[PDB]
Design a protein around this ligand. Structure first.
Ligand SMILES: *[C@@]1(=O)C(=O)N([C][C]C2=[C][C]=[C][C]=[C]2)C2=[C][C]=[C][C]=C21
Ligand SMILES: *[C@@]1(=O)C(=O)N([C][C]C2=[C][C]=[C][C]=[C]2)C2=[C][C]=[C][C]=C21
Ligand SMILES: [Cl-]
Ligand SMILES: [Cl-]
Lengths: 187, 187
């Protein structure tokens, strides 16, 4: 049975951090839903790339739960995720069911906002460290990808492939991750 | 004065190879136009990500010429670029004016289709090598990025950052490329 991924897409999301995991997960045979935070309409990402979501978050939630919930970064995208009651509910449910939560760049600051995964070892973009560490609720890592149980975090656009492949390995195993990796021409 | 980039977006384009250069070029202060081959409507990329172009190619051509013309890959995207008379005209004009042409993955096979840059040293995705080399009109390279004068080629999704930064360096210089690179958290 195919694994299912929910990618939450807010205005100001970093488009590279959105597209690389969506694409790589689809290469791995994962059923991915790109879900628009604000509804069904196109989303203007941080560098003005416009992505049309597969569905509204409201609609995608009805088809839950998911094997992974993915939070892209981008400062303004993460702030929108952080402020969302819908996101809070989704992450709480996911954590409670021991499902994977994956967040990159400023994305992990939404975990702080929603009180998710406290005590975890996490990374973020270097510029997001102070925000993430406010209160000392996590332990900070400079690893490019940090997986602490079911909280999987990463640093930036340049770690997006590693982040995506870690999700793939978590859901579908090491062999599938290696097979998906080889055609990408990664270093 | 700001440099200007034309990114030609066809159905079946590899979305990572489209988004990473667009984003990175915008970070470099380049004015980027994402131009829809088929018109103004949203484009379904290879892994089903849907991108809304800034304009139709027909309209973007009127605002030419550009400091770089960028051809993403994806097998079916490159085939669409290869079959396009509009693309032929754009590339011919660009080559004739000694403007930069950048192509990644299967993207460089459009240069073959349109008889652009013959004699150049080029790379492609490993799977696209035989197509690109049909007739021996180029010399083949396994470098992750190959820049031979005004023909700049690269291999795959995993070389997209390097490809994008090479464009930036070509247009805006080494210092700007280094400054844009550092926040991306690249290895
Ligand atoms: C990344 O996509 C992201 O989310 N960044 C924001 C980091 C940040 C900056 C200032 C305050 C809080 C958080 C970021 C920055 C640069 C490159 C990528 C990304
Ligand atoms: C890349 O984006 C691309 O264009 N690929 C197609 C390569 C190809 C395959 C078969 C025949 C001709 C060309 C490709 C393949 C795998 C990963 C990325 C890309
Ligand atoms: Cl940002
Ligand atoms: Cl493809």
């Amino acid at each position: 049975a195919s694994k299912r991924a929910l990618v939450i897409l807010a205005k100001g999301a970093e488009e590279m951090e959105t597209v690389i995991p969506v694409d790589v997960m689809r290469r791995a045979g994962i059923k991915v839903t790109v879900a628009g935070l604000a509804g069904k309409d196109p989303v203007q990402c941080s560098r003005d790339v416009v992505i049309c979501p597969d569905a509204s978050l409201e609609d995608a939630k009805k088809e839950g739960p998911y094997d992974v919930v993915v939070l892209p970064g981008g400062n303004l995208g993460a702030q929108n995720l952080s402020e969302s009651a819908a996101v809070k509910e989704i992450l709480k449910e996911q954590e409670n069911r021991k499902g994977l939560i994956a967040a990159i760049c400023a994305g992990p600051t939404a975990l702080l906002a929603h009180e998710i995964g406290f005590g975890s070892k996490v990374t973020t973009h270097p510029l997001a460290k102070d925000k993430m560490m406010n209160g000392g609720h996590y332990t900070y890592s400079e690893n490019r990808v940090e997986k602490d149980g079911l909280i999987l975090t990463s640093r930036g656009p340049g770690t997006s492939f590693e982040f995506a492949l870690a999700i793939v390995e978590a859901l579908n195993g090491k062999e599938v991750a290696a097979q998906v990796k080889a055609p990408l021409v990664l270093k």
